[PDB]
Amino acid sequence: GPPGPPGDKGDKGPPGPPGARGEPGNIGFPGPPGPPGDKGDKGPPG
Amino acid sequence: GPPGPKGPKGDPGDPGPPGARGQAGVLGFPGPPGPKGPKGDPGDPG
Amino acid sequence: GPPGPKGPKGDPGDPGPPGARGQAGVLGFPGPPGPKGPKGDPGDP
């Protein structure tokens, strides 16, 4: 006789894996300048 | 003649592709402040 | 008759989830020293 009907479609595959973690962020900008130095010492007395 | 029996089921599908790589991390924050500046020069002698 | 043909292969799976965002970047390099301080007062007479 003729061949029978075609079989059913297979099961859907499972999901793929997560992507890689993103790259680290860029380095931050440089810090601010420090505070000014203290006032100089008073001159010695004459 | 009668048709034959139904064919076999298809094979399971393949796993999916990996997800996209993650986004880049946040930029770092600004660096530490610099040191205190040099002390002033002393005053003149009296 | 003979058995029918095999069914079609299943569909591929979904793509995986997007990755997690990266780590924060390192903090910047230090700033420069501050300016020099002002000159001290003159000595007393």
Side-chain angles (χ1 to χ4, degrees), chain A, chain B residues 1-26 28-46, chain C residues 1-26 28-45:
Chain A
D8 294 340
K9 184 169 173 73
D11 298 338
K12 182 173 163 185
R21 183 85 171 272
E23 290 286 354
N26 204 354
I27 302 168
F29 294 110
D38 296 329
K39 182 168 166 68
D41 292 336
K42 186 175 176 69
Chain B
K6 178 174 186 176
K9 185 173 171 175
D11 288 344
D14 297 327
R21 183 161 191 183
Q23 299 152 337
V26 299
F29 49 73
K36 188 172 199 158
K39 183 168 179 174
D41 287 346
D44 290 358
Chain C
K6 178 182 181 72
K9 182 164 173 177
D11 288 340
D14 301 331
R21 189 171 187 190
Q23 296 179 332
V26 72
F29 287 102
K36 188 172 172 63
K39 191 174 183 182
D41 298 330
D44 286 326

